[PDB]
């Protein structure tokens, strides 16, 4: 509760234009900033979670990080994170959070026609179930959904997106759009 | 209570870039981003056109940067940055520099001329307290006060801080 709140939290976002994709990471104590992590990944490809396995494997912070958090299932538009195999690989649980509701019908009418859909089907269904909790839409890897909750709720200073999402999406932002 | 913009770099064998970050009471609002060229000459635009651009631009109180020095030595001119920005400009620095040294390391470069008048321009530097600065557009005392109120721990604005982690990170992690 109050102790959760001083967990070390990576909160992780990004964004794309026409040409690149960054993807940006933050890490957090109490809504302190700690570090950054960045990387770059294909617009609709396939690397997203080696990607982001690899960025998480040079934080200095790794073995303190408490919990990973992301702003959904997929970077870069269609470049889908493999959420369970970012919490095996790293060792650290995944909590995605959505202030809307994805349309996951809508995503699978364009993912169908990208290259390797098999995989990326495979990678939305281990994504597991969005639980409806509060105004946000959460799913899970290492986690369950109450414990996904009281995590979100440790990871907030202003507003309902963890912080250091928050902040990630300001830089990745910056970078892209400015 | 101010909005502060702290400016940081970071560079490597190809590629510099410049990261600003809006804090206010230390808590992030905002980020801007550039490239410039190591050891060129575009800083000082480069710095200018991205405070332009950006949302806080009639919010900020004061402009803070590590040392004149980016992208190597890319100098910047503060002079210039406050007149056409009119935000004012604090250099905070933990190290006195040996402008001595600093002086002879650049005669290799292109336009040392031009170099040299923005090496001037920055002006008297300031032991305050523990840290040295540089101000354009502030007297000593009024850019003591703003430093003062810029830190969270340690003794450097915090978002140069936050802006050095960014850059690093983009560049070197």
Redesign the interface.
């Known amino acids: 509760g109050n102790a959760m709140k001083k967990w070390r939290f990576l909160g992780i976002d990004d964004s794309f234009d026409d040409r690149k994709c960054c993807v ?1 990471g933050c890490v957090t104590c109490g809504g ?2 700690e ?4 990387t770059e990944i294909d617009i609709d490809g396939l690397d997203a979670t080696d990607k982001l396995i690899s960025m998480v494997r ?1 934080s200095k912070f790794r073995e303190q990080i408490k919990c990973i958090f992301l702003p959904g299932i997929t970077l870069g538009g269609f470049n889908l994170v493999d959420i369970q195999r970012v919490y095996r690989e790293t060792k650290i649980p995944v909590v995605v959070v959505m202030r809307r509701k994805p349309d996951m019908e809508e995503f699978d009418s364009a993912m169908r026609n990208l290259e390797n859909y098999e995989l990326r089907r495979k990678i939305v269904e281990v994504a597991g179930e969005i639980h409806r909790i509060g105004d946000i839409y959460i799913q899970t890897a290492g986690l369950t959904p109450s414990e996904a909750e009281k995590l979100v709720k440790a990871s907030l ?2 507003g309902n997106m963890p912080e250091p999402v928050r ?1 990630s999406h ?2 990745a ?3 892209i759009h ?1």
Do not use: D, M
């Open positions: 940006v302190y900033v570090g950054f992590l960045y040079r200073i202003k902040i300001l830089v932002s910056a970078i400015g």
